[PDB]
Design an enzyme around this catalytic site. Structure first.
Site, PDB file in Angstrom:
ATOM      1  N   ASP A   1      -2.545  12.222   9.764  1.00 18.11           N
ATOM      2  CA  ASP A   1      -3.890  11.884   9.302  1.00 18.11           C
ATOM      3  C   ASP A   1      -4.631  13.198   9.073  1.00 18.11           C
ATOM      4  O   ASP A   1      -4.635  14.065   9.943  1.00 18.11           O
ATOM      5  CB  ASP A   1      -4.579  11.036  10.385  1.00 18.11           C
ATOM      6  CG  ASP A   1      -5.997  10.574   9.956  1.00 18.11           C
ATOM      7  OD1 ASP A   1      -6.704  11.290   9.212  1.00 18.11           O
ATOM      8  OD2 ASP A   1      -6.359   9.425  10.284  1.00 18.11           O
TER       9      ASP A   1
ATOM     10  N   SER B   1      16.294  14.289   6.319  1.00 10.06           N
ATOM     11  CA  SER B   1      14.947  14.658   6.751  1.00 10.06           C
ATOM     12  C   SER B   1      14.168  13.410   7.196  1.00 10.06           C
ATOM     13  O   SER B   1      14.470  12.208   6.826  1.00 10.06           O
ATOM     14  CB  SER B   1      14.232  15.497   5.687  1.00 10.06           C
ATOM     15  OG  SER B   1      13.703  14.679   4.648  1.00 10.06           O
TER      16      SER B   1
ATOM     17  N   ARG C   1       0.835  -1.222   0.000  1.00 14.84           N
ATOM     18  CA  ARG C   1       0.000   0.000   0.000  1.00 14.84           C
ATOM     19  C   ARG C   1       0.865   1.266   0.000  1.00 14.84           C
ATOM     20  O   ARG C   1       1.674   1.451  -0.921  1.00 14.84           O
ATOM     21  CB  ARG C   1      -1.055  -0.102   1.108  1.00 14.84           C
ATOM     22  CG  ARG C   1      -2.015  -1.266   0.905  1.00 14.84           C
ATOM     23  CD  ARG C   1      -2.555  -1.779   2.224  1.00 14.84           C
ATOM     24  NE  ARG C   1      -3.224  -0.733   2.981  1.00 14.84           N
ATOM     25  CZ  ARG C   1      -4.464  -0.279   2.746  1.00 14.84           C
ATOM     26  NH1 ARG C   1      -5.194  -0.785   1.762  1.00 14.84           N
ATOM     27  NH2 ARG C   1      -4.978   0.682   3.505  1.00 14.84           N
TER      28      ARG C   1
ATOM     29  N   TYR D   1      -6.516   5.340  18.389  1.00  8.62           N
ATOM     30  CA  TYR D   1      -5.912   5.641  17.093  1.00  8.62           C
ATOM     31  C   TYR D   1      -5.693   7.157  16.967  1.00  8.62           C
ATOM     32  O   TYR D   1      -4.607   7.636  16.635  1.00  8.62           O
ATOM     33  CB  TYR D   1      -6.795   5.136  15.943  1.00  8.62           C
ATOM     34  CG  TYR D   1      -6.301   5.611  14.604  1.00  8.62           C
ATOM     35  CD1 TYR D   1      -5.161   5.062  14.019  1.00  8.62           C
ATOM     36  CD2 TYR D   1      -6.931   6.664  13.959  1.00  8.62           C
ATOM     37  CE1 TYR D   1      -4.669   5.531  12.812  1.00  8.62           C
ATOM     38  CE2 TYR D   1      -6.484   7.126  12.734  1.00  8.62           C
ATOM     39  CZ  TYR D   1      -5.340   6.567  12.180  1.00  8.62           C
ATOM     40  OH  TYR D   1      -4.901   7.030  10.975  1.00  8.62           O
TER      41      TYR D   1
HETATM   42  N1  LIG Z   1      -5.020   4.368   3.805  1.00 10.97           N
HETATM   43  C1  LIG Z   1      -5.508   5.591   4.112  1.00 10.97           C
HETATM   44  O1  LIG Z   1      -6.533   5.997   3.574  1.00 10.97           O
HETATM   45  C2  LIG Z   1      -4.849   6.503   5.142  1.00 10.97           C
HETATM   46  C3  LIG Z   1      -5.533   7.617   5.642  1.00 10.97           C
HETATM   47  C4  LIG Z   1      -4.971   8.463   6.609  1.00 10.97           C
HETATM   48  C5  LIG Z   1      -3.681   8.181   7.041  1.00 10.97           C
HETATM   49  N2  LIG Z   1      -3.027   7.094   6.550  1.00 10.97           N
HETATM   50  C6  LIG Z   1      -1.687   6.848   7.105  1.00 10.97           C
HETATM   51  O2  LIG Z   1      -0.760   6.628   6.065  1.00 10.97           O
HETATM   52  C7  LIG Z   1       0.174   5.567   6.464  1.00 10.97           C
HETATM   53  C8  LIG Z   1       0.164   4.348   5.551  1.00 10.97           C
HETATM   54  O3  LIG Z   1      -1.209   3.944   5.355  1.00 10.97           O
HETATM   55  P1  LIG Z   1      -1.625   2.474   4.749  1.00 10.97           P
HETATM   56  O4  LIG Z   1      -3.126   2.376   4.544  1.00 10.97           O
HETATM   57  O5  LIG Z   1      -0.694   2.093   3.635  1.00 10.97           O
HETATM   58  O6  LIG Z   1      -1.217   1.669   6.109  1.00 10.97           O
HETATM   59  P2  LIG Z   1      -1.670   0.179   6.533  1.00 10.97           P
HETATM   60  O7  LIG Z   1      -1.768  -0.681   5.281  1.00 10.97           O
HETATM   61  O8  LIG Z   1      -2.846   0.207   7.492  1.00 10.97           O
HETATM   62  O9  LIG Z   1      -0.390  -0.287   7.404  1.00 10.97           O
HETATM   63  C9  LIG Z   1       0.942  -0.005   6.966  1.00 10.97           C
HETATM   64  C10 LIG Z   1       1.837  -1.124   7.464  1.00 10.97           C
HETATM   65  O10 LIG Z   1       2.003  -0.868   8.851  1.00 10.97           O
HETATM   66  C11 LIG Z   1       2.532  -2.063   9.406  1.00 10.97           C
HETATM   67  N3  LIG Z   1       2.147  -2.325  10.802  1.00 10.97           N
HETATM   68  C12 LIG Z   1       0.921  -2.384  11.370  1.00 10.97           C
HETATM   69  N4  LIG Z   1       1.010  -2.734  12.679  1.00 10.97           N
HETATM   70  C13 LIG Z   1       2.325  -2.947  12.952  1.00 10.97           C
HETATM   71  C14 LIG Z   1       3.132  -3.368  14.128  1.00 10.97           C
HETATM   72  N5  LIG Z   1       2.531  -3.612  15.327  1.00 10.97           N
HETATM   73  N6  LIG Z   1       4.470  -3.511  13.923  1.00 10.97           N
HETATM   74  C15 LIG Z   1       5.068  -3.189  12.755  1.00 10.97           C
HETATM   75  N7  LIG Z   1       4.423  -2.819  11.600  1.00 10.97           N
HETATM   76  C16 LIG Z   1       3.068  -2.691  11.681  1.00 10.97           C
HETATM   77  C17 LIG Z   1       2.022  -3.256   8.549  1.00 10.97           C
HETATM   78  O11 LIG Z   1       3.138  -4.002   8.025  1.00 10.97           O
HETATM   79  P3  LIG Z   1       3.265  -5.611   7.846  1.00 10.97           P
HETATM   80  O12 LIG Z   1       2.150  -5.685   6.777  1.00 10.97           O
HETATM   81  O13 LIG Z   1       4.674  -5.827   7.465  1.00 10.97           O
HETATM   82  O14 LIG Z   1       2.880  -6.337   9.106  1.00 10.97           O
HETATM   83  C18 LIG Z   1       1.237  -2.551   7.440  1.00 10.97           C
HETATM   84  O15 LIG Z   1       1.352  -3.216   6.161  1.00 10.97           O
HETATM   85  C19 LIG Z   1      -0.252   5.176   7.880  1.00 10.97           C
HETATM   86  O16 LIG Z   1       0.540   5.912   8.796  1.00 10.97           O
HETATM   87  C20 LIG Z   1      -1.705   5.601   7.997  1.00 10.97           C
HETATM   88  O17 LIG Z   1      -2.196   5.851   9.374  1.00 10.97           O
HETATM   89  C21 LIG Z   1      -3.569   6.253   5.639  1.00 10.97           C
END
Ligand SMILES: NC(=O)c1ccc[n+]([C@@H]2O[C@H](COP(=O)([O-])OP(=O)(O)OC[C@H]3O[C@@H](n4cnc5c(N)ncnc54)[C@H](OP(=O)(O)O)[C@@H]3O)[C@@H](O)[C@H]2O)c1
Ligand SMILES: NC(=O)c1ccc[n+]([C@@H]2O[C@H](COP(=O)([O-])OP(=O)(O)OC[C@H]3O[C@@H](n4cnc5c(N)ncnc54)[C@H](OP(=O)(O)O)[C@@H]3O)[C@@H](O)[C@H]2O)c1
Ligand SMILES: NC(=O)c1ccc[n+]([C@@H]2O[C@H](COP(=O)([O-])OP(=O)(O)OC[C@H]3O[C@@H](n4cnc5c(N)ncnc54)[C@H](OP(=O)(O)O)[C@@H]3O)[C@@H](O)[C@H]2O)c1
Ligand SMILES: NC(=O)c1ccc[n+]([C@@H]2O[C@H](COP(=O)([O-])OP(=O)(O)OC[C@H]3O[C@@H](n4cnc5c(N)ncnc54)[C@H](OP(=O)(O)O)[C@@H]3O)[C@@H](O)[C@H]2O)c1
Ligand SMILES: COC(=O)C1CCN(C(=O)c2ccc(CNC(=O)c3ccc4nc(N)sc4c3)cc2)CC1
Ligand SMILES: COC(=O)C1CCN(C(=O)c2ccc(CNC(=O)c3ccc4nc(N)sc4c3)cc2)CC1
Ligand SMILES: COC(=O)C1CCN(C(=O)c2ccc(CNC(=O)c3ccc4nc(N)sc4c3)cc2)CC1
Lengths: 250, 249, 254, 239
Positions: free
Chosen positions: D142, D136, D12, D155
């Site tokens: 969020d 950097s 992702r 969260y």
């Molecule tokens: N998707 C959205 O719409 C959205 C919206 C607002 C903010 N964000 C922010 O943008 C960033 C990336 O989003 P995303 O949707 O790509 O994230 P995501 O798929 O929910 O998670 C990113 C990765 O975080 C890792 N993770 C979760 N729990 C963990 C733990 N206990 N230890 C180590 N790694 C862990 C997982 O890796 P593994 O798979 O290797 O276990 C997961 O694949 C995040 O910070 C998220 O809060 C996303």
């Protein structure tokens, strides 16, 4: 000797409730109005029936123009002529209507009305209040939704954003004179009487706390706190009185 | 085929650096100016020497008045007259001076500080949208808008209004595919009228490098926001301030 | 019957001023403390001498750990044990010290103390307060003691600052989620109030001189006044608001 | 060539960020917790384009007594593989509801939501700065942090804490020449898409990556403490 307050746009709705509660607290009041002379006069008579010689009215258009500075100086002056002092200014009067960016007032009239009432007149009133000068303070009626604007209300929103800046700028500049400057930011309060209940209910259902708009009196209660001795160290602060509405995502 | 941009107040300082960097990126530019006629014409000459027929000047006073709408309409019209399109507006022109609350008329101060910083951007935005790929507007805001300078009420009110416009116009113009964003400098090119000791006082406050932003550093953020790398960004204001807004009293 | 409040960290300083002011307003109070047992008992004695059986103490460490949830549950339980109800929670207890990013407690102890006291304990106390509730008279609310300078942080106070930011998030999240239950959640954000006792007079005066309104720190009573407002019926439509009580300090540029 | 660490980089947004940094010329440490196959698949793809430019690093980012050592080893993996660490992207995130009014224990949810979203970024920031050019850090924030999702208190607290770390670290590390900034996605299903002003659609991961590329670039050399929303305008829409 009783303190005195000016409330702009005080003839009806929120500014009326503010003037009433300030009066109940012991203030003598200048009830400023623009078009609502009969309602301003009826409020002054009610208050003077409660305590003689404690309310006067002051008519002025707060639209921006060459004459607005003199008008704002005259509102403040009317408080000193009636009561010999001016302790509180409440900037409540506000024009509110849409100004779409894409397509019978000209747009410069809309600018003068929306930026003049919501921002320029508060600034000129603030200048006149300070120049004329205990527990002195100014309260500006802001908008809890200023960062999640209604569609097609750009000039209104710009005026309310400018008022945030005035509230902060004036708090810093007037702090050495002992004048506090704060704001009260309603979310949804008194809705239009003409608005259909089906539309009013759409708005009421968005509010987390009670699914109901604020009463004017609930807005006035925050104003009474900010002008009180219980807020003597508070300046530059804007209190939302919005039942949680600004925290709700789309 | 080349897109076209309007930059207000583009004869000198930050607006010049924005016009130059848009021109380097491939844009045709309208260089708006008010008093700086020699500097505006010199810049248009330099850009035209690099690629012929890619720069024009357009003179206007952006003080609020009953003719400001027509002036703003004419700025946008000059871009369509010269280049047949107008893809980017940068609202950069700005009046800046103190307006103490306690002891030019005050209504002139209101017309200049609120007109240049907020009303003219609003009218330019209206004209840009009405006159209508990758359309966008960038407003030059102020990273210090919530930690105002002493005695600058009307200036600060104008910059706060410009935040409101950025957000309101982003919402309203999103369905037309126009993005609206801001760039907020902290201290960049210091006022020409400023003494050296005062300049250094301000430089010493900046966490990152103890120096002001170059105009080109501000222009870089504008370039990003108008680029295809920012196609999902609207309503955002990027501080370019070396951390200044995070420093307490 | 009198309403009852829990105030955390209430033996001294701002938390004591809040307990005293709630007591003067007619509340029965739980004076929570951690180490300040003598000061807590002395305060409860003073309030009990004013009105019988209207103050009790409750000891608890609010550092994060696997037993923090039970400790927070027991604080709320203590208010119901003493007074039969719990109308107000004031999350005042706070650890405050630097955690420089670039070079004694281990970093995990610093996390447990700075994030536990300033954010996790408020979260768990909020859960236990709301769970223990579950019509013409009720006025339930929580007040979190936040920090007006949260967005202009002190150099080398990262974990403290993260904790206070987390508390802004809890204030807004809990206001949204508990509004349906009639529980309002608000914050009071001092700038400089009672300066740390450790500080010398010169260092105190440097901070005093930065305040626009009066060039002095807030009294504890000034902070408590804003708390009293937010729990009162004059704030019945206010939820999710954080009131700065900072004499303008947060508006002052570098 | 400069080197970057990206946490949660196997899928992702984190994957798109690693790909784009690699395309810009960075060598990359692909951190993963459970997604080893996906992390190695990405490293295989990047190394096929340019040999020995991508390594993987396993760590659980849940808060515990061993988190500090784990975070130190992520940064050390970058120095081991590439001799330098120019960029840290704190992307890994746990996301699930924690209702205040009622089967992980609440303290496990604290450890995961606050540990992954805020404490791991703090320890990684400490280790990155201690081990030290255009340096950097970019924190994934969020855009909806002040209009939180219902029942997502822990969260939301973690993401608020991450805004505080972004700003505190920007101030503290500016003297080291380390900039610290944030990118705040909105949404990156059709119900959510329809409320977004720009195009009624969610952000691609690549659009998030584009903002990260800008902030680590020399075009952002004066920018620190800034959080760029990449949300299509969604945060500006009232209820
Ligand atoms: N998707 C959205 O719409 C959205 C919206 C607002 C903010 N964000 C922010 O943008 C960033 C990336 O989003 P995303 O949707 O790509 O994230 P995501 O798929 O929910 O998670 C990113 C990765 O975080 C890792 N993770 C979760 N729990 C963990 C733990 N206990 N230890 C180590 N790694 C862990 C997982 O890796 P593994 O798979 O290797 O276990 C997961 O694949 C995040 O910070 C998220 O809060 C996303
Ligand atoms: N009602 C709400 O839900 C709500 C929500 C957010 C913020 N607020 C703010 O709270 C304040 C009070 O709200 P409200 O609903 O009571 O306001 P309102 O009824 O819209 O307006 C208040 C008064 O403003 C005066 N005013 C309007 N245009 C004027 C002009 N050109 N010159 C002089 N005075 C003028 C009018 O006086 P005359 O009648 O005498 O002409 C009017 O009665 C306002 O500042 C508003 O923006 C209200
Ligand atoms: N410099 C900084 O440190 C700093 C800090 C924060 C924000 N900003 C913002 O960044 C932008 C650029 O800053 P800057 O220092 O380059 O600006 P500036 O030199 O103060 O002014 C830019 C130009 O605005 C034009 N302008 C002023 N009054 C005008 C009027 N009545 N009508 C039309 N144009 C007028 C002038 O054009 P002519 O010369 O042609 O008359 C002037 O050259 C501004 O919006 C500013 O507020 C700058
Ligand atoms: N003072 C200021 O200028 C100022 C400025 C901004 C914000 N605030 C906020 O206002 C609130 C009150 O400030 P203050 O100066 O009165 O606070 P303080 O004296 O620093 O601390 C209040 C109480 O917190 C309790 N506490 C500390 N660590 C604890 C732990 N691990 N477990 C349980 N309790 C613990 C202590 O109780 P025992 O003594 O019983 O151990 C302490 O007396 C705090 O939340 C502070 O962050 C204060
Ligand atoms: N017409 C509308 O589209 C509309 C927009 C927003 C609302 C909710 N906001 C308020 O009602 C509101 C918001 C601000 C405001 N300021 C005034 N002077 S009156 C006033 C009313 C209701 C109807
Ligand atoms: N005169 C001053 O007292 C003063 C106030 C603030 C500063 C720092 N701010 C800026 O230099 C600045 C800030 C905003 C701004 N807007 C413009 N159009 S030029 C401009 C310059 C410098 C001198
Ligand atoms: C020996 O000197 C001290 O007392 C130490 C503690 C305070 N300290 C400071 O640098 C410092 C930072 C900010 C201030 C102004 N802020 C406050 O006093 C303040 C701010 C938040 C806060 N939260 C608490 N639980 S107590 C508390 C106090 C005062 C001192 C380091 C040295």
């Amino acid at each position: 000797e009783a303190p005195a307050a000016v409330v702009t746009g005080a003839a009806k709705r929120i500014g009326r409730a503010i003037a009433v509660k300030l009066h109940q607290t012991g203030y003598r009041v200048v009830i400023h109005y623009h078009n609502s002379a009969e309602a301003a006069v009826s409020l002054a008579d009610e208050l003077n029936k409660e305590r003689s010689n404690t309310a006067v009215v002051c008519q002025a258009d707060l639209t921006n123009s060459n004459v607005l500075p003199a008008s704002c100086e005259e509102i403040i002056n009317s408080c000193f002529r009636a009561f010999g002092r001016c302790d509180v200014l409440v900037n409540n009067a506000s024009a509110f209507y849409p100004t779409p960016l894409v397509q019978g007032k000209t747009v410069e009239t809309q600018v003068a009305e929306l930026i003049g009432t919501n921002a320029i007149a508060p600034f000129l009133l603030t200048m006149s209040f300070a120049q004329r000068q205990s527990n002195l303070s100014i309260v500006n009626l802001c908008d809890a939704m200023v960062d999640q604007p209604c569609m097609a209300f750009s000039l209104y929103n710009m005026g309310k954003h400018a008022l945030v800046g005035l509230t902060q700028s004036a708090a810093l500049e007037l702090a050495p004179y002992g004048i506090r400057v704060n704001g009260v930011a309603p979310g949804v309060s008194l809705l239009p009487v003409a608005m259909g209940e089906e539309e009013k209910d759409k708005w009421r259902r968005k509010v987390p706390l009670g699914r109901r708009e604020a009463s004017a009196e609930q807005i006035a209660d925050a104003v009474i706190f900010l002008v009180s001795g219980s807020a003597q160290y508070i300046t530059g602060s804007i209190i939302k009185v919005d039942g949680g509405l600004s925290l709700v995502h789309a």
